């Protein structure tokens, strides 16, 4: 009938025994082991203190970070005595101003009051730009004229900066840019560049997130759009186009929500009372405000009776200060003083009123609404003065903290954002600068209210990795950093690509936003952390979780330890995740010169011919040595280094070199001794050996072009694989690639290298098989039928017509099959190939499913889902029956014990027709969550507590209706 159970489990038990012996006995895995040992004291072991590890880390983002805000200060305090000791000329000679520009063509070979500066620019590898280090340059925006009075008078003094702008780098060469937003639109970066090389330039520094956040507090927004018919026609698409714009004004500690009203007000989209403003409710936002109609009669007694109520809901999170309200209409009649009057006597909600469009309807009412509701008035009449008249409001909100004296200046960092100069993932360290002109003798505070500008030096995220270096710990063991609204600062999983915001729909500028829960998101124990890191506390948990492999198909459920403390001072929060058998390292000696002249005998170019392709890790390890991204070159100057100095003295990583070189000995003393006796074996393509440390050792000579894995060894899936199993990792090639297959380049399984120091365990390397696939398949074959079972077949064979014979590894991907149309699609998932049985097995339990979202993916026409399977209830006998499609096929499951595959075997697919529904494992483009169902359950954050909103000196007269 079909194979009893003690035959599956005899047959399972062959070719476990096979497998394993030959992936023992040929990738030498004891031999290994034994050299590490028998070639002790060239080494020491030292620990890993997680608990100094991160203070010392701590510590140093803290010194960065203070290096980085006295610069801001001292910017500051110049750039406010420079402008309180101007005059204001109204006449200019015509050559009396002097800059750069940033913009003009470098070659013009031919003004009103400018002259202009021919700079020299000859490179730098700090930005990748061409730089001047003699004077900084200016970026006037297109709309706003370069010769205008006042932009001239702040060229004067701002060219005092200058100075300023030199001791700064020359106290701390590392700083990046210092650049000084302008609150008329001019900004001046240090480093002289040319501005960004379709190419109309559109920037505005009065816009750039820093800015914003620099120039006043969070705010609770309640956009008020007015729906009626006379906007109807171009005044509907001005709103629309305004609210868009504005909406891009706001940052993640702001809260706005968006309302309607024709005659009875509602809410534009699913939103009821107030979202935080991220990537993903802006975004809803917009496409609500976007997909507005216009009817009926305006009434505004209703409108600002539902915005009022909307701005005093404190159920849910919010900034709670700068309650403002806007109010997008065309032109009314009511001024509504009794709503006024009822809702808001102490005047604590500021109302901004817009009169959108070119009509001729009664705009009296509105500034006035403008002007008793502290406020101010604005009008767009053309898409062209939409950004200006959205991009004013921080003016009249940045008031009270200029009132409040040296209270307010407290350098405040952005979210990590891509540099307008394409420099990467940066932030901005912002701190407001104050008009105190007549501020010694108390005669001015006319205008003395409003600020000058924003100050800002970026530091760049790759300062901060160099401050946490991880090349002593396991390639599973990182840092990461937490500010108070969750994001990350530093995550492996974090990439210079914009955030996602759903399916690209058919026919830079944003902030990277990660949260730390999109790493991979546990209920139980990641929560907490996040929350009591958010908190500012410091502790460590040690817990079972669940880790998914790089390539993003595996997951292992691992042992972390996540140890946290604050960056006092600041308010990121730093953590470090380490694993059980990472608490310890090795720690190369000191040697001779004789050792590093045979351990540098061994990986030379021509001489990896009777030692395998030998490879190296792009790692810094000397200063003039310089990261390739081809490895031959790196390999051909790593020996030409290490031959033409020692490696310590010469302000080089001493440490570093000294354990790649150790490594370098050990494999090539292993490949000569172990591998170099057997030349060619039945079942194996290639012998491979990659060690903590940045070497890796293809024997085979042919072998070494179809290595297509990463160089480096800590960013090695099957490394990271293999360390976090006890046991050998058979890792599925890829399927339908341009690369080569699984018939000329095999089958890799990997085992990793287990060492006893004193009592401590260390796992410094692992060795691996490339298993042959005819070999393996003419195997498969003889081992498991019997030859006189019975006249129908009783197992499978080259070409069983009824019986499937599959096997299976830990991530539902197919390595071998019975059939020739079946082996064809070897590292295809077999959902694909038999949806039926797949699903059968996820519902009694074999290939445990839980899903993932990418937001940093790109798509062909965005946020990506992603699925891994893996075991989840370690056990052997695994016997069911289908019941598919009135054709029930009995199937049986083993496990071989110490690899971690499984051999199902089915009656027949073919033969038995079913649905197919075909179970897809790959990353398929949907849709994030419901943003309606996440704000209405909102993750814990921790905003801002200081908040400058009211203040009794400020002066109300600037109300904007009288003065035009
Ligand atoms: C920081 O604050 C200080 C003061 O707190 C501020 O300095 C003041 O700047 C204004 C210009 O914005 C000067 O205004 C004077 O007023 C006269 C009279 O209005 C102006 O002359 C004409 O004014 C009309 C409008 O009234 C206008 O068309 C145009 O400005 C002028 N027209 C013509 C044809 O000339 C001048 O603008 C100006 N007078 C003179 C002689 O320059 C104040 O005098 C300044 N106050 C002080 C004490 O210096 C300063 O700008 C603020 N910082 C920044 C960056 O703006
Ligand atoms: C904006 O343009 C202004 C006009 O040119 C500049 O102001 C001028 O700078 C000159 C220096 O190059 C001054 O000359 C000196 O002033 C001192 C005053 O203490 C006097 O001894 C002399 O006039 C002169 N001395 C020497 C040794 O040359 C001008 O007085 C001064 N003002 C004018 C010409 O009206 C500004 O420098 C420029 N803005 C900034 C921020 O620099
Ligand atoms: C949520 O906000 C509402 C008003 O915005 C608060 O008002 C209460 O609503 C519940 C709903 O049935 C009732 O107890 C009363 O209608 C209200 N109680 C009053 C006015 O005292 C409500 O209290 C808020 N939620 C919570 C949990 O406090
Ligand atoms: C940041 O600074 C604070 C001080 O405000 C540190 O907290 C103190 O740490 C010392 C030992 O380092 C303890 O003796 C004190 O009791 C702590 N004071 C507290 C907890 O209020 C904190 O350790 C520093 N953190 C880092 C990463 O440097
Ligand atoms: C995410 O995947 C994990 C991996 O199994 C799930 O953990 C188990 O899930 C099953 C049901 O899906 C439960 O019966 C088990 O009790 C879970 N194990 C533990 C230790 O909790 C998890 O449920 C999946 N879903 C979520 C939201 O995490
Ligand atoms: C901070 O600045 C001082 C001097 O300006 C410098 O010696 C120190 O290395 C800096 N710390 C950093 C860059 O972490
Ligand atoms: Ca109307």
Same mark, same amino acid.
């Given at each position: ?289 976007? %997909? ?15 915005? =009022? ?197 058919? %026919? ?106 030998? =490879? ?35 302000? #080089? ?41 940045? !070497? ?80 393996? !398949? ?10 006189? #079972? ?38 295809? =998932? ?53 019941? #598919? ?17 499984? =051999? ?61």
């Amino acid at each position: 009938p079909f194979p009893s159970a003690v035959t599956i489990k005899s047959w399972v038990d062959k070719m476990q025994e096979d497998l394993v012996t030959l992936a023992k006995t040929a990738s030498g895995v004891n031999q290994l082991v034994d050299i590490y040992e028998k070639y002790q004291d060239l080494y020491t072991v030292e620990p890993n203190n997680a608990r100094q590890l991160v203070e010392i880390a701590a510590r140093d983002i803290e010194k960065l970070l203070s290096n980085r805000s006295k610069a801001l200060v001292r910017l500051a305090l110049e750039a406010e005595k420079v402008q309180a000791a101007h005059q204001w000329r109204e006449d200019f000679a015509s050559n009396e101003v002097v800059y750069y520009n940033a913009k003009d063509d470098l070659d013009p070979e031919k003004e009103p009051g400018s002259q202009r500066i021919k700079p020299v620019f000859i490179e730098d590898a700090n930005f990748g730009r061409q730089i001047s280090y003699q004077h900084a340059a200016v970026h006037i925006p297109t709309d706003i004229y370069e010769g205008s009075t006042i932009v001239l008078n702040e060229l004067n003094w701002t060219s005092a900066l200058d100075e300023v702008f030199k001791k700064n780098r020359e106290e701390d060469p590392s700083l990046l840019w210092q650049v000084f937003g302008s609150a008329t639109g001019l900004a001046r970066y240090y480093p002289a560049s040319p501005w960004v090389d379709n190419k109309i330039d559109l920037y505005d520094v009065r816009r750039r997130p820093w800015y914003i956040q620099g120039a006043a507090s969070p705010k609770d927004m309640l956009i008020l759009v007015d729906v009626s018919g006379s906007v109807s026609g171009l005044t509907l698409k001005l709103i629309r186009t305004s609210v868009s714009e504005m909406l891009e004004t706001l940052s993640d500690d702001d809260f706005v929500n968006v309302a309607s009203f024709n005659s009875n007000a509602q809410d534009v989209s699913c939103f009821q009372h107030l979202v935080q403003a991220n990537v993903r409710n802006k975004k809803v936002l917009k496409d609500a405000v976007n %997909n507005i109609t216009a009817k009926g009669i305006t009434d505004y007694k209703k409108g600002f009776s539902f915005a =009022f109520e909307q701005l005093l809901n404190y159920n849910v999170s919010r900034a709670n200060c700068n309650k403002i309200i806007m109010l997008f209409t065309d032109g009314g009649e009511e001024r509504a003083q009794e709503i006024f009057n009822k809702y808001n006597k102490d005047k604590k909600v500021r109302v901004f009123t817009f009169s959108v469009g070119q009509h001729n309807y009664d705009r009296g009412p509105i500034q006035w609404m403008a002007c008793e509701n502290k406020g101010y008035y604005y009008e767009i009449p053309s898409i062209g003065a939409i950004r200006i008249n959205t991009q004013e409001y921080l003016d009249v909100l940045g008031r009270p903290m200029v009132l409040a004296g040296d209270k307010a200046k407290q350098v405040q960092w952005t979210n990590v954002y891509l540099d307008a100069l394409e420099l990467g993932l940066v932030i901005t360290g912002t701190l407001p600068v104050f008009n105190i002109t007549g501020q010694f003798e108390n005669k001015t505070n006319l205008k003395n209210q409003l600020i000058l500008g924003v100050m800002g030096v970026d530091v760049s995220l790759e300062d901060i990795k160099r401050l946490t270096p991880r090349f002593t710990l396991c390639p599973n063991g990182y840092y990461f950093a937490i500010d108070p609204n969750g994001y990350v600062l530093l995550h492996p999983n974090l990439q210079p690509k914009p955030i996602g915001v759903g399916i690209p729909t058919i %026919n830079s500028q944003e902030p990277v936003t990660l949260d730390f829960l999109d790493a991979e998101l546990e209920n139980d124990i990641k929560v907490e952390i996040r929350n009591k890191m958010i908190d500012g506390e410091s502790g460590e948990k040690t817990f079972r979780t669940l880790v998914k492999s790089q390539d993003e198909r595996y997951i292992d459920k691992g042992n972390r330890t996540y140890t946290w403390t604050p960056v006092n001072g600041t308010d990121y929060s730093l953590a470090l995740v380490l694993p059980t058998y990472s608490f310890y390292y090795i720690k190369a000696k000191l040697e001779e010169t004789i050792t590093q002249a045979r351990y540098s005998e061994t990986l030379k170019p021509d001489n990896f011919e009777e030692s395998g392709y030998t =490879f190296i890790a792009p790692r810094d390890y000397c200063n003039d040595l310089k990261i390739s991204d081809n490895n031959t070159e790196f390999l051909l100057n790593f020996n030409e280094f290490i031959d033409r100095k020692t490696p310590n003295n010469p302000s #080089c990583n001493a440490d570093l070199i000294n354990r790649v070189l150790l490594d370098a000995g050990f494999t090539n003393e292993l490949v000569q001794n172990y591998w170099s006796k057997q030349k060619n074996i039945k079942g194996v393509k290639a012998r491979f050996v990659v060690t903590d440390g940045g !070497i890796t050792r293809v024997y085979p000579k042919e072998a070494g072009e179809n290595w297509q894995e990463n160089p480096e060894t800590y960013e090695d899936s099957f490394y990271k694989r293999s360390l976090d199993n006890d046991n050998y990792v058979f890792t599925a090639p890829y399927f339908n690639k341009s690369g080569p297959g699984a018939y000329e380049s095999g089958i890799m399984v990997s085992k990793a290298v287990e060492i006893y120091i004193q009592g401590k365990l260390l796992k410094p390397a692992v060795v691996g098989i490339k298993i042959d696939v005819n070999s393996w !398949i003419e195997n498969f074959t003889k081992t498991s039928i019997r030859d006189p #079972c019975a006249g129908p077949v009783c197992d499978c064979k080259r070409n069983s017509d009824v019986m499937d014979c599959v096997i299976l590894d830990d991530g539902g991907f197919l390595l071998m099959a019975n059939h020739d149309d079946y082996t064809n699609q070897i590292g295809r =998932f077999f959902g694909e190939i038999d949806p039926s049985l797949m699903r059968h097995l996820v519902n009694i339990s074999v290939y445990a499913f839980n899903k993932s979202y990418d937001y940093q993916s790109v798509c062909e026409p965005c946020i990506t889902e992603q699925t891994q399977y893996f075991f989840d209830n370690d056990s052997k006998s695994f016997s069911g029956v289908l019941d #598919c499609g009135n054709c029930s096929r009995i199937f049986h499951g083993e496990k071989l014990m110490n690899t971690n595959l499984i =051999f199902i075997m089915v009656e027949s697919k073919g033969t038995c027709p079913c649905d197919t529904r075909l179970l897809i494992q790959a990353e398929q483009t949907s849709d994030g969550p419901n943003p309606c169902d996440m704000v209405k359950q909102p993750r814990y954050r921790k905003g801002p507590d200081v908040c400058f909103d009211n203040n009794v000196l400020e002066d109300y007269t600037d109300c904007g209706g009288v003065s035009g």
